[PDB]
Amino acid sequence: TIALSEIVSVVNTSDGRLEVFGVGTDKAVWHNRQMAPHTGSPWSGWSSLKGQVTSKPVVYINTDGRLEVFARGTDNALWHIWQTATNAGWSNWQSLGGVITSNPAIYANTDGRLEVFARGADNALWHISQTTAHSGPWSSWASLNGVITSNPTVHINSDGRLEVFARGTDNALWHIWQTAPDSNLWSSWESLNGIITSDPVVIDTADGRLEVFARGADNALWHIWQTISHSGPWSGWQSLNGVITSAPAVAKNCDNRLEAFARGTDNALWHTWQTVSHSGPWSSWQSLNGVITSAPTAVRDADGRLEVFARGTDNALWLTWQTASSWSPWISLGGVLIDASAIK
Amino acid sequence: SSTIALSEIVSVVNTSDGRLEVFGVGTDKAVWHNRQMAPHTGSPWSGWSSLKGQVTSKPVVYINTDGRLEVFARGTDNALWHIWQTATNAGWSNWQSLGGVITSNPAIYANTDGRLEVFARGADNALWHISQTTAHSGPWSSWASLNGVITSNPTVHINSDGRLEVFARGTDNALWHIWQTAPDSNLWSSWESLNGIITSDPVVIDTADGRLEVFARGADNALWHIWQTISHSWSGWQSLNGVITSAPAVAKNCDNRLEAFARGTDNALWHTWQTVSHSGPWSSWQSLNGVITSAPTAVRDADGRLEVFARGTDNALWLTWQTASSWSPWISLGGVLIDASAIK
Ligand SMILES: C[C@@H]1O[C@@H](C[C@@H]2C[C@H](O)O[C@H](CO)[C@H]2O)[C@@H](O)[C@H](O)[C@@H]1O
Ligand SMILES: C[C@@H]1O[C@@H](C[C@@H]2C[C@H](O)O[C@H](CO)[C@H]2O)[C@@H](O)[C@H](O)[C@@H]1O
Ligand SMILES: C[C@@H]1O[C@@H](C[C@@H]2C[C@H](O)O[C@H](CO)[C@H]2O)[C@@H](O)[C@H](O)[C@@H]1O
Ligand SMILES: C[C@@H]1O[C@@H](C[C@@H]2C[C@H](O)O[C@H](CO)[C@H]2O)[C@@H](O)[C@H](O)[C@@H]1O
Ligand SMILES: C[C@@H]1O[C@@H](C[C@@H]2C[C@H](O)O[C@H](CO)[C@H]2O)[C@@H](O)[C@H](O)[C@@H]1O
Ligand SMILES: [Cl-]
Ligand code: NA
Ligand code: NA
């Protein structure tokens, strides 16, 4: 078990449009993009990329701008589909083999090779990668060992080393990392302790330190960080308080101030934000209303505003965004979305 | 034309850990640098320290995809020389020669595969270039030519689809450009003219909506600009007025609104900015005071605030930044800087 997941994967595209990906009642991947690179732009509407997926689909922007969606398939292998060019159509769904047991986690190495991390049948962390930048063919799968109990999350350090996080068998946050950029040489697994009851959410701060967010045993929102840019030692666990009934989402305001979002005990969107600057103390929790049935997903848009997405009581994706003063009334992008996360 | 508007005095970069760090040439012809202590507006500065060398161009810093800074400059023997941090944000190597014979300041960008590629004018007046053979690493490739005959320092930027594109003034004084036909490629297009008459180095940026847009001073000494019509497509040349006595400097506010800077006829800092949003109209020119003896250098710091550097009447480097309402008063970072620009 883990706190209620995010219903969609979202990306700010190379032309500054938000674009959201989720699973339909039919088990296919569907997407929705902004027309215009602005807060409040009209949306395309939901359209199908087809496939039949058995995990959350996860979008990533290749270093040449082209989106690529990863999702577990009906055969439990990793499959993908990618734009043929930045403002063009899509490929056919294609298989990368393997047998996996979590949602895929994706990051681009410093050399532009996308690297995919996913849980195995053995419950280890496995990985596979592009052989050259933003392009097939891909490597063979190999394992990074471990025994993990959540979906993994990956983020690049400010020195180019990929680093992967997942819950362990003791329910602590565990991590593993590249010892050199673009490398196949990884550390051992190391515990960062704690007790976590959601997927980790990982952020690179403005000052170059990995910060992990997670729900605790008390259902508060807790966070732990690197104390030095791309380096240990780590901090201790620190509570941001709150009582949250979903997974948290975290993103950066345009001034780099972190801002955490989560479903509350009342099923509204609540948030807490850094005050003053990117190294300032956190607000108290405040409500952004609505009644939501997934964790929120947050993203900064091409106007430097945070937009937050969440499923509604009618199973459609709803949207609220920052304004000069406040936030905008909930609006509906329509659709009917399922939670297809491969671990719940 | 054998002249261009007064060049920038330093080259600025956002460090891997989010600090501003400027590089210039002292009276001994060595490359010197200064950085902020902490990544906030109005942080104290380290003071100037020497990386030695003897340079006959402006030194141009670029950040590798692993976070290590690397400084490029023409040497006393007209070869391209370089010096790099041997570990992200830590110590520096010795200067080494990349050979070649060049006649401009060097222009640098990362390919989508992490390989830096350096462009500069040759002895034969054509555009030459060289690159790292693997991501953020030597050895370097052979020098090669993209032909052309150019009369300004070249400017390189990457398209929103990963193709590098280089801009330089031609022998008819028009803006000319030439581009990669694929990312990471040695395949380029032919040279093409964007017409106009330019009296400065071109300055190039990527808009939030993924368009290359080039600013340059014109024949009437106004700031002009031109752009790609669609992401990685040009428009006509449009004037932004002013009478400017230096090269311009463009940077993005945290909401992505462009803002241009340049020295006035009264030798003060002037600015004009996009209003409302990043597709908004351009304000009229306003003074930021000060008396400057170079073109300004503009950059967004980790507080989402714009900071502008310019040499002063005393030859020190001076600084003013955006506040909540206005701009801070000009302050001196000291040092004694010269214009070592290979083309003036
Ligand atoms: C994600 C994948 O979706 C499907 C791939 C299908 C493969 C076929 O060439 O095109 C279809 C749509 O026209 C795809 O949907 C499944 O068959 C596969 O097993 C897996 O679940
Ligand atoms: C993620 C972690 O994986 C395992 C760590 C193991 C720790 C040991 O030093 O090396 C093994 C393989 O070389 C790891 O698999 C679990 O024992 C641990 O409790 C936790 O779940
Ligand atoms: C996210 C929020 O966290 C909770 C706790 C918050 C706990 C903190 O110590 O004080 C705040 C102000 O009194 C509370 O709002 C709930 O009150 C609320 O229903 C929601 O779940
Ligand atoms: C940029 C370079 O700077 C100098 C490099 C020097 C190379 C020497 O071995 O060590 C010195 C450090 O104290 C450097 O300054 C010039 O000799 C060279 O010709 C070139 O102009
Ligand atoms: C940048 C441009 O370089 C030259 C373009 C030339 C155009 C010609 O047809 O092909 C040559 C070989 O590649 C180019 O060198 C100049 O003649 C032009 O005036 C301008 O300065
Ligand atoms: Cl001088
Ligand atoms: Na969501
Ligand atoms: Na490239």
Author numbering:
A (entry chain B): 26 to 369
B (entry chain A): 24 to 256, 259 to 369
Paper lines:
As mixing PHL with the branched compounds leads to protein precipitation and thus prevents co-crystallization, the direct study of complexes was not possible. Crystal structures confirmed that all the studied fucosides were able to bind the lectin PHL. In each complex, the electron density was clear enough to determine the position of the fucosyl part of the compounds in 6 out of 7 fucose-binding sites of at least one PHL monomer unit – A or B, while site 2 is occupied by Met60 of the neighbouring monomer, as was observed previously. The second saccharide unit was clearly assigned for all three fucosides 2–4 in sites 1 and 3. Considering fucosides 2–4, the position of the bridging methylene group is close to the α-Me-Fuc O1 atom, which is not directly coordinated by the protein in the complex. The O4 of the d-arabino-hexopyranosyl unit in fucoside 2 and 4 is coordinated by a glycine backbone nitrogen in sites 1, 3, 5, and 6, while the O6 atom of fucoside 3 is linked to a tryptophan backbone oxygen in sites 4 and 6. When comparing the overall orientation of the second hexopyranosyl unit of fucosides 2–4, it is similar to the galactose unit of blood group H trisaccharide, with minor distortions in individual binding sites influenced e.g. by crystal packing. The remaining parts of fucosides 2 and 3 were not resolved in the electron density, suggesting their negligible importance for ligand binding. The second saccharide unit of studied fucosides was only marginally coordinated by PHL binding sites what, together with affinity comparable to monosaccharides, suggests a low importance of this type of compounds for inhibitor design.
As a part of our ongoing programme focused on host-pathogen interactions at the molecular level, we identified a lectin in the P. asymbiotica genome designated PHL, which we prepared in a fully functional recombinant form. The lectin PHL interacts selectively, mainly with l-fucose and oligosaccharides containing terminal l-fucose residue, and prefers an α-glycosidic bond over a β-linkage. The PHL lectin forms a seven-bladed β-propeller assembling into a homo-dimer. Both units contain two types of binding sites situated between the blades and have different amino acid compositions and binding preferences.
